[PDB]
Amino acid sequence: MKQTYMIVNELDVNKGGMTTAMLTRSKFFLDNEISGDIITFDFKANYKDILKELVQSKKMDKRTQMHNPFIYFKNISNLQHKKYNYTMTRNLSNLLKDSVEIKENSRISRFFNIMSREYLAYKRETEQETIFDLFKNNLRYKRIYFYKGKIVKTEVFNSDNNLIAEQFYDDNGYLYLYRQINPEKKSIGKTYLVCKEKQFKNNVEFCSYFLDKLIPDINDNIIICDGPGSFPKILKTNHKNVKKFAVIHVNHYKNFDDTGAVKKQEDYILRNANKINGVVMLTEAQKKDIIEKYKITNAYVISNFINITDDYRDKNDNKVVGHISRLVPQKGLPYLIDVAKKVVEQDNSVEFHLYGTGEEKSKIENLIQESNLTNNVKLLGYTTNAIEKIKDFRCVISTSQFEGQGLSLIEAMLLKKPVVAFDVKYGPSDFVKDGKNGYLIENKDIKKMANKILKLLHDKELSKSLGKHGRDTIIDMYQPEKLMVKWKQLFN
Template sequence: MKQVYQLIFNLGLSSGGKTSALLSRSKYFNENNLNSNIVTFDYNSDYDFVLEQLRESKRLDDKTKVYNQFSFFENRSLSMSASTSNININIQDVIDDCVKIEVDKNKYALISLENGEYRGNIKYNSQNKFVLDLFKNNYRVRRVYASNCLIKRIKEFDYNGILNGETFYNQNGQPFLRRSSKDGSVSDLYLIAEKKYFKNNIKLGEYFLEELIEDTKNNIIISDGTGSINKLVNNKQRNVQKYAVMHTNHKNSTGIIKEKEENILKNSHKLDGVIFLTQEQIDDVEKEYGITNAHLIYNFISNIPEYYGQSTNKVVGNISRLVKGKGFDLLTDVAKKVKEIDPEITFHIYGEGDYKDEILKMIDEKNLNSTVKLFGYTDNPYKTIKGFRSVISTSQSEAQGLSMIEAMANGVSVVAFDIKYGPSQFIKDKINGYLIENKNVDAMATAIIELMNNDSKSISFGEYARKEIVESFEPINIINQWKKLFDN
């Protein structure tokens, strides 16, 4: 049976569309005799909790195995390490040699019992989890991270407070990985028990994949993260099938090429195939980069609801990562124009991201506090979408647009700027939604007001929108495309 290994940097509880697409694909692969595995490369001492929550919410299929780079090498070190030291005992001795004086809630200064010297401070995040800062001559030199009462990681700093290295420990308190930090970049990595040296993170990742995955044609690697592509194209295994998925546009909103996305396109000849989500993007990259192994396969859409519908309230919805490229400046401009004509219409935004404070600032400056409301991350998009009359997309860069597709699957029409590449593939202007000339906020405001105040048109658009998505995203058709690709 074929084993599929899907690469992504990390798994999080509030991850966006790319992670959702990967998790859905894993579920359908497992159901169709393709064993699914997910491979991650980040360090997270709470990974077990994250996976438990993802499985409990049914986002992560129970049959899917998850392999993490750090966990893999930590587990191997338990049987390979020749060390008899235990960092947990050493650190506990430091703590025991001090008196703890509370300086803040759950935070204590450590004062030496021997000479009264300030040794550092310890902050308890929970009963079994703490962060310990150790000082020398009043300078922080080490930061110790403990989880489940075990030391997991120690960072080292110079006298200017700059990180210059860190060490990772296994559950026996033995060091298994050491790496340096120069100018903010990771370098010079040492797998201690395995006596292996790596120049950078990419080289460690290459070694990890080659150790994890046997070199046979029944093993397949799919890179879902742009940051993982170098680990794949440099992979020395000759028989393993290798693919990359282009989840995003390879150009930004101003037409400038994105470096990481272009890296996939320039290295496509080293892969068995590159998967795209729209035919229009394939046409462009074949012309621009001479790619000959491009394939159109849609993302799976999980659990298309049997019962669907839209709200009768005048609510315009948006589910998105809160990042600059999603066009929230334009969304708030549209909302301002809509408010001037119909103040009953409200805009509900669901999501999290580093642009949140900027959005709140725009809302305040444009006097939209009663019109545009932020609700945070939702882990149940279909239930959330049922509260919308329509969905708005002001994004300036898309490949497919999962939130738009989920809205249409729920019988809710979408009003979107007509950008490359996603919206026009499924939105048929004035039939199942509106495609608006990019950045034409007046036209978008007019379209929204029309849908909010015309029940028959809103319902008709929603019905046609759902029909389009159900037909396009029939799971068996998508599975058969993947199987055909793997078999060829």
């Protein structure tokens, strides 16, 4: 009879560990007769296709449902009419009625009012999607989005081409939701629900009302806030009986700040711990650090559910050092290239395969070229099947400067791969056993990391032994039954 709702701002493919962790948790909860649902708050006209991909890629259980304010209010609005209203598309065809189409590309075209001698619109047509940008005095004031033959959204722009309003349309062609946007802050302001003729101060108030309409106020309903940015929305609900929990997925300390400063979103959660049933941390070390500074009495440690990869035959016998992560400063990728320099200096046969996408791509490319390591260090971009790539690595490394739990290393260890990681807050210290399943290195010590990389690369038998112990360590340490008991204890 227990229903859980796991909250994050958005769900997509090629998302990080947090979304994977929520989806894994849902699967295990559902295997234990506990409904686990996902709730998002963003607009995606193609959410159906994303959810379809997630379930077919086996990342999402078929019984895991996603609720969303746009989907929710659109389905309710669809009941209000029987026929499709074409007023919007008629208004567009009326604007371009006295205009000539000048095809600029195969996809792009421009509309020129023969009479007004003014270019009124730009159109871009792709597969299942047509965009119209509307212009007056050579200034865009509106964008119209056609998806699957119908208008799904319009955007209003000011004279600076900054978004000032958004409008959302139901499957009958009617406006059901519109919101003001702060032009320079790009923050969501006054939101208006057409059906209920209801106004909201901001997106937080609107999403809190959505949660009040979606989740019945009973004790058997549980809210688990995973997305730190979503916490205000769960806190500002009118629920009095629904159990509310917050999961800290990351080192709460301000990134690359040793002043003891804490991230704003995590600070807000921890200062409001008394207003919720409990805060869940992934490691005992993190609980200790938080309890020391915040004096929280409802802090609990439950590790992420670990999907135990099936045993396999390791055929590969190469010198490949692997790394799969989003290209973000946290992953200490500049330290990775310094390690690579020292490793290639000792063996030019060594290759560093870096999978993932992110903002640091350009910086890392420059470092690789500057260090003349283009033949050894390779940015292999985004992969769908990371497990397959890991099966072909000799070892996997982590130069990460902060971690919440450190699941990338756990995944590698389960695939019988040895691991060399920097000892960092809430990371390897729990599972990496020095000389047994890999090597825990002093943070920012490139030489010590390079030494252990070469050690493993030169001793294939050592690598295999360490790898075997890695899988065994994770199997004995992370048993899903233990974690399920801890969750059920919180729900009771």
